[PDB]
């Protein structure tokens, strides 16, 4: 609307090759390639946003005289068909969702 630039540079992509993810219980879990409803099978895809390499330009437009700062990747919980053990499981997994600026005192 008025914003010309972000304080943090990010990258947003479709993730179609996900094999591992940490669930809500903080445990490493195997992510399945396919899910289904009563009729059709679907390939598992996720939308992910993360910080671009530096972590930026220190965030952009930060008052350096008063604050130390860095861009950091934050996450969301998305439901995914996974494998806990022998059984298949529709569980909440942690995935990259944003790139935010975090401040620290000088």
């Amino acid at each position, epitope marked *: 609307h008025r914003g*010309e*630039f972000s304080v943090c540079d*990010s990258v*947003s*992509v*479709w993730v*179609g090759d996900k094999t591992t993810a940490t669930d809500i219980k903080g445990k490493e879990v195997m992510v399945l390639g396919e899910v289904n409803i009563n009729n059709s099978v679907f390939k598992q*895809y996720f939308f992910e946003t993360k910080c671009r390499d530096p972590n930026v330009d220190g965030c952009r437009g930060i008052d350096s005289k008063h604050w130390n700062s860095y861009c950091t990747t934050t996450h969301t919980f998305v439901k995914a068909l996974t494998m806990d053990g022998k059984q298949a499981a529709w569980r909440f997994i942690r995935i990259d969702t944003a790139c935010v600026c975090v401040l620290s005192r000088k």
Partner: antibody
Amino acid sequence: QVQLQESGPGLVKPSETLSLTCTVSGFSLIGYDLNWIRQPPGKGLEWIGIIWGDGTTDYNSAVKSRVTISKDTSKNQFSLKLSSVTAADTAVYYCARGGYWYATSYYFDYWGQGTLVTVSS
Amino acid sequence: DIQMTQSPSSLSASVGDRVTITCRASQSISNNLNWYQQKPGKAPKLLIYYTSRFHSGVPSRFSGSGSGTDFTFTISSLQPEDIATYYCQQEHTLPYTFGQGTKLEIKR
């Protein structure tokens, strides 16, 4: 690093099928969307269709019955097929990749240089 | 289908001038509007996305504004390299639609 290059025959006979490929590099065809946009000589731009990262498509209603957009990740290519071709299809065809700023904003960030396709007997 | 109407269709202005291009949507598109610049014989190049956001390698002289139905593209100090056809583009709903373009020439 990001490169898109369209190719195809500059001449298609009316009622035949127009066939274009878009050869890419610098990004994965699984994580990015590809769009086909056309520009008739001396005219504006028209979006024809999209192939999202997941492989799902959507075509503009104006051309819908004649459009086929596919992708070959092994050959780093995207195809466009426009059936039952007429002089209204004479245009510079562009392949453009879509880019996202979260799920908030979408834009055509990288374009090919375009290939002119003429429909004539 | 949302229709984008750009004004003026064509414009001549001197180097150093402030140029203002308008984009008008048929229905509200909120902030889902992009601006492209197409140089003679070249593919369109993205300048602005989400009404006012700068893409990579865009001059500080360019800017975007607007909301819902009314949008603006400004060149603060028009330069000789700005010779191009500018297009606005709606991304609020499918199908994606562009304005008819604003041809920009230089008075010299």
